[PDB]
Amino acid sequence: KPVIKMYQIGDKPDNLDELLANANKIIEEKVGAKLDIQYLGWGDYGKKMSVITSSGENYDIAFADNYIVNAQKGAYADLTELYKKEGKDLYKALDPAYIKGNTVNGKIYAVPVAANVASSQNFAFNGTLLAKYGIDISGVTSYETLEPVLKQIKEKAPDVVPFAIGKVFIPSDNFDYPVANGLPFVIDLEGDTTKVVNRYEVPRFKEHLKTLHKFYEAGYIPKDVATSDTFDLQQDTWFVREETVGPADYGNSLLSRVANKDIQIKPITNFIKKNQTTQVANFVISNNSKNKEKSMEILNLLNTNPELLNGLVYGPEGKNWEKIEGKENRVRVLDGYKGNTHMGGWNTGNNWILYINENVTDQQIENSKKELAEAKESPALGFIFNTDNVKSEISAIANTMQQFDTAINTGTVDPDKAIPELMEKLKSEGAYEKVLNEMQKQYDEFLKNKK
């Protein structure tokens, strides 16, 4: 009977009507409701979602935007009770880090999509060029050790961009940024895990920037890196890129499929479960929703029913995909899947009930299982930085930071010159040390509780 309205980020599938009509046969029979999914786009999602949540505007489910803050404001139904019955199977199937990462004032407001609960940063190499020039990447574990292979591609293929990075680039390390900004503050997971530090004062981080500046000067990264936001994976204009890979991607499988060619990966950071990885794809139930129970029931089903979820994420069976006879849980993806004819895997539901593409090797499935099992939590997982005392000081730092940020992070300027200038500018007003100490203070209390 009741129509449950869901808001989703991005652009609709071409066949959304058909997808939902197929899905709703299962939903209607299982729960006695029907799902309506409306897509609000990519660009202005926050903006659109903020209007919806501020007014008494009717919706039941939404892909959450600015989740942590809105959860504190009571914008979302408390799922604590919802999870013991209606969301029982979903709660049981969720990795503990998903609950921890999404708890706000002692309660859970989210149905997170179980996927890349942990992720690593990787160099992704263009296998076509790797094979053409016989370039050996077995020594590559860091920015520093990337240098010899960049020199070789510069040698051998001078029109190719060696390291394809853009204006958004910053070196990755084993750091946790618990609060999504804006700000240079991290927990160094290899340092003192009790201390909030500035990334630009971490010795090996400064070394990454020195390396990147050398890479800049040698022509390994675009001259116009600071203004560029361009390198389609399928094209051969690039040699190496930085890519986030998690267990739901099955190693190089996802990248190699999208690139439609061999993509080889070399990790540079450890697989970590943190705020960023546990909060990336959350569904929320509206605080002012007439069917909280049934909305939760649909979410339970979306995340536990293989036929339902696979129909949505892979699209029409027989046209977009086929089951492999004799191989349970395995599918052959067809030409139709190349279209905009299905929903996204990352933001629809539990990836662990998704059928596994035939091109994923046995070793990749095993490697994925192990990485997921062996992934450690950050000590800052579930840390909420309350900005109420420091909202003005935060904007002041952001304002200063945003002037020098891009030049430094891309390695456009010499960090030996630019970091001391930026630090001097920040330390010359009062905002910087206030936000740092406030963050440290809250992180102290966070670790004291728990313990």
Residue numbers in the entry: 40 to 269, 271 to 491
Please give the exact wording used by the authors of the publication that reports this structure.
The genome of S. pneumoniae contains genes that encode a suite of proteins that are biochemically capable of performing the various concerted steps needed to completely depolymerize and transport all classes of N-glycans found on host glycoconjugates. Here we characterize SpGH92 (TIGR4 locus tag SP_2145) as an α-mannosidase that trims the terminal α-(1,2)-linked mannose residues on high-mannose glycans to generate a substrate for EndoD. We also identify a solute binding protein (SBP; NgtS) from an ABC transporter (ABCNG) that binds soluble N-glycans and, through X-ray crystallography, reveal the molecular basis of its interaction with these branched glycans. The identification of an ABC transporter that possesses an SBP, NgtS, that is specific to the recognition of N-glycan fragments suggests that this is likely the convergence point of the complex and high mannose N-glycan processing sides of the N-glycan degradation pathway, with this transporter functioning to import soluble N-glycan fragments into the bacterium.
We tackled this hypothesis through a functional and structural analysis of SP_0092, the putative cell-surface attached SBP of the ABC transporter, which we refer to as NgtS (N-glycan transport SBP). The structure of NgtS is similar to that of other SBPs and comprises two α/β domains separated by a hinge region. Each α/β domain consists of a central β-sheet of three β-strands flanked by α-helices, with the N-terminal domain possessing an additional solvent-exposed two-stranded β-sheet. As with other SBPs, the ligand-binding site was found at the interface of the two domains comprising NgtS and ligand recognition involves a transition from the open, unbound form to a ligand-stabilized closed form.
